[PDB]
Write an enzyme that holds these catalytic residues in place. Sequence first.
Site, PDB file in Angstrom:
ATOM      1  N   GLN F  10       0.821  -1.207   0.000  1.00 28.85           N
ATOM      2  CA  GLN F  10       0.000   0.000   0.000  1.00 28.85           C
ATOM      3  C   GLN F  10       0.856   1.259   0.000  1.00 28.85           C
ATOM      4  O   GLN F  10       0.827   2.052  -0.954  1.00 28.85           O
ATOM      5  CB  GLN F  10      -0.921  -0.024   1.221  1.00 28.85           C
ATOM      6  CG  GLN F  10      -1.959   1.069   1.264  1.00 28.85           C
ATOM      7  CD  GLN F  10      -3.032   0.886   0.226  1.00 28.85           C
ATOM      8  OE1 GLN F  10      -3.022   1.541  -0.811  1.00 28.85           O
ATOM      9  NE2 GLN F  10      -3.971  -0.008   0.499  1.00 28.85           N
ATOM     10  N   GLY F 134       1.525  -6.201   6.384  1.00 28.11           N
ATOM     11  CA  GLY F 134       1.825  -7.598   6.154  1.00 28.11           C
ATOM     12  C   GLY F 134       2.600  -7.835   4.878  1.00 28.11           C
ATOM     13  O   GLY F 134       3.671  -8.449   4.907  1.00 28.11           O
ATOM     14  N   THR F 169      -2.005   2.192  13.157  1.00 31.41           N
ATOM     15  CA  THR F 169      -3.226   1.700  12.529  1.00 31.41           C
ATOM     16  C   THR F 169      -3.560   0.293  13.007  1.00 31.41           C
ATOM     17  O   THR F 169      -4.609   0.061  13.618  1.00 31.41           O
ATOM     18  CB  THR F 169      -3.079   1.728  11.009  1.00 31.41           C
ATOM     19  OG1 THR F 169      -2.292   0.609  10.583  1.00 31.41           O
ATOM     20  CG2 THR F 169      -2.400   3.010  10.575  1.00 31.41           C
ATOM     21  N   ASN F 196       5.075   8.404  10.726  1.00 33.78           N
ATOM     22  CA  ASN F 196       3.889   9.177  10.399  1.00 33.78           C
ATOM     23  C   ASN F 196       3.589  10.265  11.416  1.00 33.78           C
ATOM     24  O   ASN F 196       3.114  11.336  11.030  1.00 33.78           O
ATOM     25  CB  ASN F 196       2.677   8.255  10.269  1.00 33.78           C
ATOM     26  CG  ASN F 196       2.678   7.485   8.975  1.00 33.78           C
ATOM     27  OD1 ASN F 196       2.277   6.325   8.930  1.00 33.78           O
ATOM     28  ND2 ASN F 196       3.138   8.123   7.911  1.00 33.78           N
ATOM     29  N   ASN F 218       2.685  11.935   0.955  1.00 37.04           N
ATOM     30  CA  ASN F 218       3.264  11.411  -0.273  1.00 37.04           C
ATOM     31  C   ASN F 218       3.984  12.500  -1.056  1.00 37.04           C
ATOM     32  O   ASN F 218       5.070  12.266  -1.597  1.00 37.04           O
ATOM     33  CB  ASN F 218       2.179  10.758  -1.121  1.00 37.04           C
ATOM     34  CG  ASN F 218       1.420   9.695  -0.368  1.00 37.04           C
ATOM     35  OD1 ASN F 218       1.933   9.107   0.581  1.00 37.04           O
ATOM     36  ND2 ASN F 218       0.188   9.443  -0.787  1.00 37.04           N
ATOM     37  N   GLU F 244      28.982   7.580  -3.115  1.00 33.50           N
ATOM     38  CA  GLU F 244      29.498   8.481  -2.089  1.00 33.50           C
ATOM     39  C   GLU F 244      28.542   8.570  -0.908  1.00 33.50           C
ATOM     40  O   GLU F 244      28.980   8.660   0.244  1.00 33.50           O
ATOM     41  CB  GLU F 244      29.770   9.877  -2.649  1.00 33.50           C
ATOM     42  CG  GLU F 244      30.793   9.948  -3.756  1.00 33.50           C
ATOM     43  CD  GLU F 244      30.154   9.918  -5.121  1.00 33.50           C
ATOM     44  OE1 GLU F 244      28.913  10.000  -5.183  1.00 33.50           O
ATOM     45  OE2 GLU F 244      30.887   9.816  -6.127  1.00 33.50           O
TER      46      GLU F 244
END
Lengths: 48, 50, 426, 426, 48, 427, 436
Positions: F10, F134, F169, F196, F218, F244
Amino acid sequence: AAHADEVFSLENRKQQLALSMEERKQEVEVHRDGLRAELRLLREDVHR
Amino acid sequence: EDNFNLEGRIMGDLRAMEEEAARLNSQIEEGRGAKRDTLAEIVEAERQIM
Amino acid sequence: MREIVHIQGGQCGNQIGAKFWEVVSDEHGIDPTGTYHGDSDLQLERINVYFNEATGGRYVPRAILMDLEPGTMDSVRSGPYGQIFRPDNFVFGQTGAGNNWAKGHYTEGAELIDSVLDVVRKEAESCDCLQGFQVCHSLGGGTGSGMGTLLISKIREEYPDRMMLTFSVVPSPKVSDTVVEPYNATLSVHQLVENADECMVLDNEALYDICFRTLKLTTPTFGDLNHLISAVMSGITCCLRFPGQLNADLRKLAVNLIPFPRLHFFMVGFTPLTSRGSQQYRALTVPELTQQMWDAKNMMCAADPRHGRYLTASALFRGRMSTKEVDEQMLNVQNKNSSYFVEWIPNNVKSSVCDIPPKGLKMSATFIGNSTAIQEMFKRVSEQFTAMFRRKAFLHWYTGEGMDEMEFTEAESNMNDLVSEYQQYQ
Amino acid sequence: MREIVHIQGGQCGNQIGAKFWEVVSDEHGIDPTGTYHGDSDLQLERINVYFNEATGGRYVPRAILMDLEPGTMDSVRSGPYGQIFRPDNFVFGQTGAGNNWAKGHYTEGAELIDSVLDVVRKEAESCDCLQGFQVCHSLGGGTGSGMGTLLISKIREEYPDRMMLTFSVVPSPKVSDTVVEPYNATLSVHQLVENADECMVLDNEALYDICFRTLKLTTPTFGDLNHLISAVMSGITCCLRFPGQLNADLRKLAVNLIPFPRLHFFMVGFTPLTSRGSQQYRALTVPELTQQMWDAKNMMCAADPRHGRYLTASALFRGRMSTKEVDEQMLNVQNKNSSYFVEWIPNNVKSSVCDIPPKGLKMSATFIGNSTAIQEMFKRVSEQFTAMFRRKAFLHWYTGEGMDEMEFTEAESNMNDLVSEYQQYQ
Amino acid sequence: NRLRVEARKEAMLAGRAGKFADVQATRIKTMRQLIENRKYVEKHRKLH
Amino acid sequence: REVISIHIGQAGIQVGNACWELYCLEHGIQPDGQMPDAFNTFFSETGAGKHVPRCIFLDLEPTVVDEVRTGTYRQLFHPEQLISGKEDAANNFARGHYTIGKEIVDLALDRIRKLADNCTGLQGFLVFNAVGGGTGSGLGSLLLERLSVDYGKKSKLGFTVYPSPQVSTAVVEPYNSVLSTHSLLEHTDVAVMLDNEAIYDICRRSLDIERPTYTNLNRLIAQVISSLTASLRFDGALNVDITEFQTNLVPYPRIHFMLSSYAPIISAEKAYHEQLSVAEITNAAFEPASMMVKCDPRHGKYMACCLMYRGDVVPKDVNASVATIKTKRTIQFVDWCPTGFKCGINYQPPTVVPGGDLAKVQRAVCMISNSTAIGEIFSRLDHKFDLMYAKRAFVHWYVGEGMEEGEFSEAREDLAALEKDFEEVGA
Amino acid sequence: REVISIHIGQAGIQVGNACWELYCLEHGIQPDGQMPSDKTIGGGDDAFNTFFSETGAGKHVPRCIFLDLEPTVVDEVRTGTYRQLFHPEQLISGKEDAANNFARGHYTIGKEIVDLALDRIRKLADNCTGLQGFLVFNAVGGGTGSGLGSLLLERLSVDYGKKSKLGFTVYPSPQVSTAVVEPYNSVLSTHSLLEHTDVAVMLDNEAIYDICRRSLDIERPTYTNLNRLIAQVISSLTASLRFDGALNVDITEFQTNLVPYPRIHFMLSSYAPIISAEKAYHEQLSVAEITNAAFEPASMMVKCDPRHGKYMACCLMYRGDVVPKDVNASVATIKTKRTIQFVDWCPTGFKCGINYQPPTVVPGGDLAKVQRAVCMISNSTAIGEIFSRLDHKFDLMYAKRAFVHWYVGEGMEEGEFSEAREDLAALEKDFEEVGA
Ligand SMILES: Nc1nc2c(ncn2[C@@H]2O[C@H](COP(=O)(O)OP(=O)(O)OP(=O)(O)O)[C@@H](O)[C@H]2O)c(=O)[nH]1
Ligand SMILES: Nc1nc2c(ncn2[C@@H]2O[C@H](COP(=O)(O)OP(=O)(O)OP(=O)(O)O)[C@@H](O)[C@H]2O)c(=O)[nH]1
Ligand SMILES: Nc1nc2c(ncn2[C@@H]2O[C@H](COP(=O)(O)OP(=O)(O)O)[C@@H](O)[C@H]2O)c(=O)[nH]1
Ligand SMILES: Nc1nc2c(ncn2[C@@H]2O[C@H](COP(=O)(O)OP(=O)(O)O)[C@@H](O)[C@H]2O)c(=O)[nH]1
Ligand SMILES: [Mg+2]
Ligand SMILES: [Mg+2]
């Protein structure tokens, strides 16, 4: 049951081949590394 | 089929490792020969200086 | 008749050399296209020391760019005056050393050195009488320190009767830009003391201080630092291209400066450097040039010469001048500052004059000192090297790539005795 | 006045010849239509060596074209400078080669060569003084390898005195573009050694390597390879067509290059080969031409000459030149490496000069070397032949067309003894 | 130089046998999990 | 020079959606995939004006993979780079590692192989995943192991989303993370951290968004990725690439976990009022609130830093800012780095996405540092996993899948060793 | 240079119907035998004189025979799209069918029609001048393509002989098959396919279905899908006689240097790049990539895995804008590769061949138009696996004497049921003998 036994044997042989390959590949890796170290020491000696 | 392909690829990787090992052995032998002949040349240089 | 081939290692070396060619091509009067369009003949009369005639008035420099990336070469070509170069000299890989000495000296260095020696051999055979090579590089990278060191060692195993001017931009701490500078600097000076014959120390710290104080610039980018370094590099070697009352070429400078068989680390200046506001309110007399030349805030090194004696010094003046005035100026300087000069060398200073100054500047001068304050930079890098190396920080990147632990300690010992010889003679 | 007759066979032979006539026609100044529209009057003087004036200036080249399918004559006529070839000079069959040496040399040979000897003999009578024959063909095909070889047999049976240049391409491991190369290579070389006078051996991997390294090309193709072969083929006959300081006729080349009658398999190379990117950087000077000549990377055949011994060599030069510099270069290169030349021959290298360089240049050369490292070329094909023939592979295509395995064994024996002779003279 | 090369080789091989401590277990664990999953092809959790 | 991108699960494919949305307008390519020498790292020129990327979006639950096909970038990708399974691992590491996972990793390899083949100057891999789930944990570990055993010599940058201390969550994501620690400790070469809670607090203060959603995070992660790769893509005054990055930011084999901080995250209404000098943005990058990871840097000592500047920056002000930072006292650089900054400067200013939440800023900074304050994150996760694991709750799901108590025990021991290694190297 | 084609059996006429469709539009001929009067696109006039023969008023007629016993499928051509194209004489159809019985199609029913078929073959070949060879399409698992085909093969070998015979024969897949007596109807025809067909290129239906599903993405393919790529392959391997190029390899060279022994001629065909119309633009199709795709084990018209065998020889007919350098580099990398092997007595394995005409795609077709293409026709050693499995499933049915009455009552005996068995055994033994 016979088919399952054959499949199980094949899976075991596959995994054992993979692990033995990993071991042997590392062994040749360290052998070649030692050869390379000998090489570089020889190069510096011959240059001097 | 997967085991056949696996065995083939492992054998190929093996011959690759001996290939590179042979290259390294040849280079080191070349270097040892160069070192000893350079010692011979240094002896000859000492003789010329004398 | 005398010949110089110029080699650029790493990104820093490539940029410095590009600006150097941008300067020297103008000082010879040839445009970026490669066709002479100047005024006099004193330019063309001895340009064979750098350039080769290609086909009817197309002069190509005798320089070899080399690194491990294509992007730097693309930038150099895209920049101005980059056309003159022969495309055959452009040698490069694709991976990149990545600030790793092991990559720049053992893997990529080994896989490119055979190719690069082919082109350096081509240049050194196309000539007639070589007197020495020039190399431009840093001491704080992979493509510049390790690869340049390998290149100069490979040269020494081939031309054992020639000098190299290795212009080394020493990694300064207050201007450091990578996490492992000392692990490169120590391991480079290890062989710089062994093979290279004139290592010219330079440092971005001193260059930035010069730009801030004297030039009074507002936004000094790398352009002006490269400009100063190129002016110094072009001024050091005008005794060949131009006729002077007292001419002194590279071997003469080397024998005059280097008293002992391993004390070749020169600290360098240049005069006159002025802001374009104070250039209207000053007099360029010979005593004024000498005073600025010995002004300790003008040498391109972070080590203040007040922290030690002068083993020897050399001055290269450019422009029609008075030789007696030069000699009496340097004598006055030595007598006034006699405490800064080695006691077992009478008349520690050498002077030379060339009858052509860099264009625009009707009079100029250059300073090359061999003062014992140079030990400051080396102790100041050895402290960092020991501090990191005590707990083997960042060390696996080299050990896994092929270096034992004892090599670092041997490099430490060589650096220590190098910095100890200056203290001994001071 | 010394006539040359060109013989083309095989698809590769037809293409190479259609490019060679391209170069020759454009340099003597005849336009595509067939008339003469040159500029200088020095080219007009020797056009008889390659051309015949029919009526009204429509020059017809003096060439014979042969094959087994019309699909090559179509391309020959279509290509540029196609209309020049005399329509009587298109002897073609109807069946096709089939890549079988049996069809090439026994079955179709009878019904094709008997018909093309009429054309070649008519051409010989039409010209006055034959200097010799130049034949460009293939060894890896069916028409050039077999039918060309049988034509070589017939021509030598007819005229014994005339020399023969045999421009022959040979197969190769890396560029093996077909699967019965060994058979059609051995069965051709067996007659080629006995019957020819100067075997100009070429290949495709060498030409691709040249077009990649020296010419820096992006997508080299048969057009470019044939252009290089054409340049060499024109350079070899430059002397007969133009005067110079020291002329060099074909018999002179053979005499100066052959120490034993069956040791006549030369290896050729061109000079200068420079990239269009860096055309205006190199110096067209005799030392540079000789340096570009004497190296493995320029030879137009898969031979590493430094892995052998140059028995003899020859160097044609073109341009306003000094024989003093030419022969001092040819002597310095000879004395640098006495090992790579044979012990019992003083002055291993012949030189010759002409005063007209090729169009589009000002100074050129052509190197033809009789080396002993060319034995490995045939050694590769010999070992391939042994491996393949030990199990009768593909043998039925031959043994079902009037051929016996005795032929195969004797051809292998001849290749073996030739390569033994080369190996012995070392 | 010979002693230094051998010391480097032995230290590296020890550091890699440290990794091989993590391949031997992955052999036996996979073998054990495979011998048991062979018996759950019929009823994976109802047989439990 | 190229790096190929893999998106697992996800968070991985959503962050990838953001990244490619940014890249297309970065290089001027229209979303349909046609341009009206620098794109080579990400896109590959095909056809008569076509530019397909070097990404593979692989996930089990098709409901979000097929969202790309339904979306406005359906023509951009190769229609079989969007690998979708048939049923998610259900937040079950064992399910995504053993039951379902092994039937899709073969296809993932069969695609990534030809991706690498069409690639020439491969610098490395970059993977996106959230070990709080998962699939992103299990499939990530399995695929990462496959890539390690196949290539090995090529580096991997894993941009891992982690369970924040409070914003959590799932209820078994401690299990998922402690199970994925084994792979992320020895296969990923450079593991970049993203929480988060920290990003949410950054959005709440600097950008003053009261109720941010998964689009702002995002976008602000795509900006960091773009700033990391601009050195490769565009030119630069003083450049630095993956090699580097790793030789300066990984002082020890088992210490590779970065903290990221972008600056200046400034909205268009305050962009005019703030003059945004180089020293100002550097200080705002080093201040202990603009970092994307919840870990008190003052609760630790810095080890190394890397600073990618973009835009109108000259290399004197960066050095002056670094000197000011080293003279500052709130942050304690550890002694083994007398120099501790890999400073790189680029020449391409940040690009603004239309309808976005950032302004056209002349210059920008991205800081990526290695410190010892991440042992705090690991310790908190270890304690909050032990809390559940004492009663062996939820373990029966993994056991019924087939995974045994072993990998749990060894994973806990590996975390303990990792924590001790950070704490020890801190001294 | 001309070739006249013969189609026998359901597969024969269907492949012909989906092959002449490609031929006519590749040469730009309207479905009524007329080139367009106003516009025209073609390499030259003599390009079409290898398949279609012009007759006076610009009305070309193909060099084809469609011979079959049942009329129910020939009538489809007679009333289909190309009614005017084929003139009524090239369409031979009997009164009733053969119905999966090799004997019934071979001896009794086929006797009445084979003389007519060959009497049209001769009056078709007389007009021909550069008769290259005979190309045949048939399904061996049937009563017409096996029986009548294997009768016509002998009746042509007795009349011409040494001419090249390219027989593109379809065998049954182990899993997908549409008969019960196909092992008999296949082995019996194999016994005479070995001894007369010079180059037997083998096909399979399951393999083509798998190719279509994997690459073309169609989940529910059919015969109209298979025959299109069959036509693609035949055009790819025949275009050298038609459109020029740098390295030309015609039927003579092909048949000449891909058959090392007078009985080892059993090719595996492959076509690259098989790609749909939605991935072709998203894929950059280079010569190396298409060559590797052609050499993939999962792309073969026969379902045999070549990793158990060795490539005795290979022949790559490229097409279109292919420069003759990258092909050499790609075959060099192929030789360097060690997943696929060669045999120790063939150190030069490949025929490169290059034609300068890009592939032509039927409008309203599943195959996309692309710049370049390649057809691989390799002589390998794993076809022994195919024959071995076929015989192994033949034994299980013959040991019970099942279905044998349908043959013996038709007129035959067990002598040939044993002769085909032992001949196939000798074929297999030859394969594993030469492979070593
Ligand atoms: N930054 C960011 N995180 C996201 C986004 N979407 C989901 N996540 C993170 O995903 C974590 C939980 O993982 P999951 O919901 O199980 O998704 P997953 O990691 O792919 O695992 P599966 O659902 O089994 O496929 C949450 O803690 C979120 O922080 C996103 O768009 N941006
Ligand atoms: N792959 C493929 N196979 C086909 C096609 N057309 C026919 N076949 C094969 O042919 C078989 C049909 O029977 P045939 O072998 O042709 O029998 P026949 O030659 O028509 O003779 P009869 O049995 O008398 O009709 C099927 O099992 C298919 O395997 C086709 O278009 N594609
Ligand atoms: N004078 C000057 N110095 C530079 C420039 N760019 C980088 N440097 C210095 O060079 C050092 C880096 O050396 P570098 O060329 O990257 O070596 P490399 O890592 O092996 O390629 C840094 O410490 C910089 O201070 C430039 O444009 N001009
Ligand atoms: N270098 C080069 N080689 C060629 C050219 N054309 C063909 N060849 C090669 O040379 C060989 C010539 O033999 P071939 O063409 O078969 O002769 P033919 O078909 O009987 O006329 C072929 O195998 C090609 O591989 C060309 O233009 N240049
Ligand atoms: Mg998920
Ligand atoms: Mg039928």
